[PDB]
């Protein structure tokens, strides 16, 4: 019940319940065998870093976004399971660099490159 | 702006000691 | 990470990414038909 249903665009989904310790790389562990993400962000406090025990995810297809909102849903991680729904919302501009930097890190995969730079 | 670092949070990528006693 | 599997068995022929460790794992929610 967080699903931003005003579109079907809905690539992000709405990881909630998580625990404080998991962090981007785990969600990629548990959410790149449904599929590849393009974007994922932790919700995380801006001062101090900490997780705020939501993340928003996007693969690049949304039908394995699909997937995961069915499948990988109720996976129990650390006493608490985490909960996927299909959200959407508009990244942040003030906190751009962590929304970048991350998809960097994916990106090295997805791009194809038998020359990276020219 | 800041010409330290760009954002103080920055993502981590790691994995859980949670999640390898999880799965 | 590596992709283990090279056989799109997944209905949505999906392949796991280059950070899946290698550890399969599935509740088995059945509100996806």
């Known amino acids: 019940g967080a699903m931003g249903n005003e579109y079907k ?3 992000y989904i709405y990881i909630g319940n998580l625990n404080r310790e998991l962090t981007e ?51 129990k991680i650390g006493g608490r399971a985490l909960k996927i729904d299909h959200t959407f919302y508009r990244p942040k ?10 998809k960097e890190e994916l990106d090295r995969d997805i791009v194809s490159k038998n020359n990276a730079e020219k | ?4 670092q760009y954002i103080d949070i920055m993502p981590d990528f790691s994995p859980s000691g949670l999640l390898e006693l999880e799965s | 990470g590596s992709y283990d599997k090279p056989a799109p068995e997944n209905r949505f022929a999906i392949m796991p990414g280059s950070r899946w460790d290698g ?11």
């Not at chain 1, 705020?52 to 693969?59: C, H, S, V």
């Not at chain 1, 501009?93 to 991350?102: D, G, I, N, P, T």
Request: aromatic share 12%; glycine share 8%; hydrophobic share 30%.
């Open chain 3, 23 to 33: 550890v399969h794992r599935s509740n088995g929610f059945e509100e996806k038909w």
């Open chain 1, 93 to 102: 501009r003030s906190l751009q660099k962590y929304y970048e930097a991350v």
């Open chain 2, 1 to 4: 702006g800041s010409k330290s």
């Open chain 1, 9 to 11: 665009d809905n690539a």
């Open chain 1, 25 to 75: 790389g785990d969600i990629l562990t548990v959410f790149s065998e449904y599929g590849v993400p393009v974007d994922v962000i932790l919700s995380r406090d801006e001062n101090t870093g900490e997780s705020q025990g939501f993340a928003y995810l996007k693969y690049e297809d949304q039908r394995s976004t699909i997937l995961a909102v069915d499948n990988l849903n109720g996976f």
